[PDB]
Design a protein around this ligand. Sequence first.
Ligand SMILES: [Zn+2]
Ligand SMILES: [Zn+2]
Ligand SMILES: [Zn+2]
Ligand SMILES: [Zn+2]
Ligand SMILES: [Zn+2]
Length: 90
Amino acid sequence: MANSSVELRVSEAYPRDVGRKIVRIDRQTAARLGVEVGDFVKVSKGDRSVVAVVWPLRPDDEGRGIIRMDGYLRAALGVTVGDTVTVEKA
Ligand SMILES: [Zn+2]
Ligand SMILES: [Zn+2]
Ligand SMILES: [Zn+2]
Ligand SMILES: [Zn+2]
Ligand SMILES: [Zn+2]
């Protein structure tokens, strides 16, 4: 079977995550992906992808269907805040 994947809305990084090879998603999404917080995920837009470590979203950001990633990772994928990307176990 293929690994599960989820589409998420691109959101700006928390300030302390800028320049770190980190994306933030919520626990429900990590569970659907079959990963735990702290594992590597692949984030893709079309044929472009990056690999980053999953850190957990803050409580009030859970359930929003978002992924927080800094401008370096957004640029790498050619996406902006408000775009959608796909996330999968790396
Ligand atoms: Zn879709
Ligand atoms: Zn769609
Ligand atoms: Zn593993
Ligand atoms: Zn766009
Ligand atoms: Zn767009």
